[PDB]
Structure 1
Amino acid sequence: STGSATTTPIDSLDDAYITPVQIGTPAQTLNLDFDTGSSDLWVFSSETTASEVDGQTIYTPSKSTTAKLLSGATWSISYGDGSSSSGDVYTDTVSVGGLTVTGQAVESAKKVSSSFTEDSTIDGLLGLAFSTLNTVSPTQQKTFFDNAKASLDSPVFTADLGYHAPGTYNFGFIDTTAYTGSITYTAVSTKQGFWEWTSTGYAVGSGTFKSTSIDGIADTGTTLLYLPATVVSAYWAQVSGAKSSSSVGGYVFPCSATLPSFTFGVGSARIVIPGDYIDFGPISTGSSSCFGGIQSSAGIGINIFGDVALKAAFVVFNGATTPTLGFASK
C-alpha cells in the first residue's frame, strides 16, 4: 500500500504545516501537525476541557463505530517549546492520504496548554519519530508509520515541505519526480528515539564550506533551524545589524536586510537554504526588527534541523531494519 497527502502551512510564515487525517467511522477529518520529533498521535476531542478549545476541530469517539477505549491507558507529553497535553486513549481507524491503519492509538486530549488552545489551525499532532518515545502508559503504543510499515510497498515516508506553499507527505514510495539530482542517504541513530544524523558541515552564502560534524535531528515539528552557537554566529555576522536579543529570545535582524543562503552538508552532498527561507518577519506587528530562522541550539541540548532546513530538501525517512535518512535538492 501507499498514501499521499498534501501538507499546508498554517500561516504566511510557515510556522507549522497541517495535513488532513481521517479518524473513525464515519470519517472525522482533523488537520494534524506531522511531527518527526515526537511519537504520539493526539487530538483535540470531545473530552478536551471546554475552556481550552478555541476553534479547533475535535474528534468525538462516541460518534465513531470503530472507536474503542484503550482501557486504563493515559498519556502526557511536554514539547521542547514548553507546551504540553495529556489525556486518555482510544483505538480507531486512521487514514492518511488513502493509507489506512486499523487499531491505531488515538490519544484524546483532556488538557492542552495555552499555546495549543491559541492555535486554532492545529487539531492535534501525528508523531513520526520512533515508537520508543510514545508516552502512553502502561502499554506504550506504536506510531502511525510503525503500524503501517509492514503493509507499505517500501518501509519509508517522505517529507516535501513547501516554502510559503503546500507540499506533500508520502508513505510507502519515493516520488522520483519530486526532486532533482540524486538522494544522498546518511546514517541514523535511534538511541534517543529521533531521526538523528550527522551533517558534514556548512557554508554561509557564497562562502567556503566548513567541514565539521553536526549531530542533530530531522524534525518536521520544529519551525526553525537550531545549530551550535559558533555556526549561528558565523551566519548572522554576515547580516549588517543582526544581533542576538535576550529580550526577544534569539537573533534578530533589520527587516530591510537581504539574507544570505545557508548550506548544510549531507555526506558529500549539499543542501542550500535560500536566504528568504530564514526570514520570519517582524518580531511584533509593524516592527522593523525581524526574527531569524537560524537560531542557537545552546539552550536546547540538541541541534534541530527543523522546517527551515527540511523545506529546502526532499527528505526520505527510511524505516528499514537499519533506518537511514535521505536528502535531495528539489
Structure 2
Amino acid sequence: STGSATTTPIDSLDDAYITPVQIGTPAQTLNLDFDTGSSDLWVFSSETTASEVDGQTIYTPSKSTTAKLLSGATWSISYGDGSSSSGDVYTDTVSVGGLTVTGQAVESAKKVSSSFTEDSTIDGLLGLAFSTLNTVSPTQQKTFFDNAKASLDSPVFTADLGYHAPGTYNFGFIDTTAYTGSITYTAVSTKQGFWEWTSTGYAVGSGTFKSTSIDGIADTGTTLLYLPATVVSAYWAQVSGAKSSSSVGGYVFPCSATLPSFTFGVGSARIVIPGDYIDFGPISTGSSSCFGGIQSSAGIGINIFGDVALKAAFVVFNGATTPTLGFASK
C-alpha cells in the first residue's frame, strides 16, 4: 500500500504545515501537524476543556463506530517550544492520503497549552519520530508510520515541503518526479528517538564550504533551522545590521536586507537554502526589524534541521531495519 497527502502552510510565513487526516467511521477529517520530532498522534476532541478550544475541528469518539477507549491509558507531552498537551486514548481507524491503519492510538486531549488554543488552524499533531518517544502510559503506543510500515510497498515516508506553497507527504514510495539529481543517503542514530544525523558542513552565500560535523535532527514540526552559535554568527555576520536581540529572542535583521543563501552538507552533496527562505518577516506588525530563520541551538541541547532547511530538499525518512535519511535537491 501507499498514501499521498498534500501539506499546506498554515500562514504566509510557513510557520507550520497542516495535512488532512481521516479519523473514525464515518470519517472525521482533522488538519494535523506532521511532526518528525515527536511520536504522539493527538487531537483536539470532545473531551478538550471548552475554554481551551478556539476554532479547531475536534474529534468526537462517541460519533465513531470504530472508536474504542484504550482503558487506563493516559498521555502527556511537552515540546521544545514550552507547549504541552495531555489526555486519554482511543484506538480508531486513521487514514492519511488513502493509506489506512486500523487500531491506531488516537490521543484525545483533555488539556492543551495556550499556544495550541491560539492556533485555530492546527487540530493536533501526528508524530513521525521513533515510537520509543511515545508518551502513552502504561502501555507505550506506536506511531502511524510504525503501524503502517509492514503494509507499505517500501518502509519509507517522504517530506516535500513547499516554500510559501503546498507540498506533499508520501508513504510507501519515492516519487522520482519530485526531485532533481540523485538522493544522498546518510546514517541515522535512533538513540534519542529522533531522525538524528550528521551534516558534513556548511557555506554562507557564495563563500567557501566549511567541512565540519554537525549532529542534528530532521524535524518537520520545528519552523526554523537551529545550529551551533559559531555557524549562526558566521551567517548573520554577512547581513549588514543583523544582531542577536535578547529582548526579541534571537537574531534579527533589517527588513531592507537581501539575505544570503545557506548551504548544508549531506555526505558529499549540498542542499542550498535560498536567502528568501530565511526571512520570517517583521518581529511585530509594521516593524522594520525582521526575524531570522537561522537561530542558535545553544541552550536547546540539540541542533534542529527544521522546516527552513527541510523545505529546500526532498527528504526520505527510510524506516528500514537500519534507518537512514535521504536528501535531494528539487
TM category, shorter: over 0.9
Deviation of the 1:165 alpha carbon: 0.1
Cα offsets for 1:75-102 (capped at 9, x unmatched): 0000000000000000000000000000
What's the counterpart of residue 98 of structure 1?
98
For residues 269-314 of structure 1, the C-alpha deviation after alignment (integer angstroms, 9 at most, x for no partner) is: 0000000000000000000000000000001000000000000000
Within a 5 Å distance, the mapping from 1:7-26 to structure 2 comes to 7-26=7-26
In structure 2, C-alpha distance between the alignment counterparts of 1:166 and 1:140, rounded to whole Å: 33
Q: For residue 118 of structure 2, what is the aligned residue in structure 1? A: 118
Q: Which secondary structure state, in structure 1, belongs to the residue aligned with residue 47 of structure 2?
A: coil
1:125-136 pair list within 5 angstroms: 125-136=125-136
CA deviations on 1:2-26 (whole Å, 9 max, x unpaired) are 0000000000000000000000000
How much does 1:127 deviate? 0.0
1:45 to partner: Cα distance: 0.1
Structure 1: how far apart are the matches of 2:298 and 2:95?
38
What secondary structure does 2:259 align onto? coil
Q: Distance in 2 between matches of 1:299 and 1:85?
A: 23
- For residues 105-131 of structure 1, the C-alpha deviation after alignment (integer angstroms, 9 at most, x for no partner) is 000000000000000000000000000
Take 1:171 and 1:303, find their aligned partners in 2: how far apart are those partners? 26
User: Which SS does the other structure have where 2:214 is aligned?
Assistant: strand
Partner of 1:72: 72
The aligned runs of 1:292-303 (5 Å cut-off) are 292-303=292-303
Task: Give structure 1 stretches of 5+ with no counterpart.
Answer: none
In 1, the alpha carbon distance for the partners of 2:269 and 2:325 equals: 13
How many angstroms apart in 2 are the aligned matches of 1:115 and 1:309? Answer: 23
Work out the CA distance in 2 between the residues paired with 1:105 and 1:327: 30
- Partners in 1 of 2:250 and 2:54 — Cα distance? 29
What does residue 285 of structure 1 align with? 285
CA distance in 1, matches of 2:166, 2:238: 30
Identity, % of aligned positions:
100
Q: 1:55 aligns to what SS in structure 2?
A: coil
Q: Distance in 2 between matches of 1:299 and 1:59?
A: 36
What SS does the aligned partner of 1:45 have?
coil
Question: What is the CA deviation profile of residues 159-211 of structure 1, one whole-angstrom value per residue up to 9, with x for unaligned ones?
Answer: 00000000000000000000000000000000000000000000000000000
Q: Equivalent residues in 2 for 1:204-215 (5 A)?
A: 204-215=204-215
- Tell me the CA shift for residue 254 of structure 1: 0.0
SS across alignment from 1:57:
coil
State how far apart, in whole Å, the 2-side matches of 1:243 and 1:235 are.
11
Give distance in 2, aligned partners of 1:10 and 1:207: 33
What's the RMSD between the two structures over aligned residues?
A: 0.1
1:55 corresponds to which residue?
55
Q: Secondary structure at the match of 2:164?
A: coil
* Superposition deviation, residue 134 in structure 1: 0.1
| Deviation for aligned residue 1:143 | 0.0
CA distance in 1, matches of 2:236, 2:31: 35
**CA-CA distance at 1:222 after TM superposition:** 0.0
Corresponding residue for 1:189?
189
- Tell me how far 1:223 sits from its aligned partner: 0.1
Q: Secondary structure at the match of 2:233?
A: helix
Q: Distance in 1 between matches of 2:312 and 2:38?
A: 21
Aligned match of 1:323: 323
How many corresponding residue pairs?
A: 330
Cα separation, 1, equivalents of 2:125 and 2:43: 7
Secondary structure of 1:107's aligned partner: strand
Distance 1:282 1:325 in 2: 34
What is the CA–CA distance in structure 1 between the aligned matches of 2:96 and 2:60, rounded to whole Å? 18
> What secondary structure is seen at the aligned counterpart in 2 of 1:147?
helix
Alignment correspondent of 2:108: 108
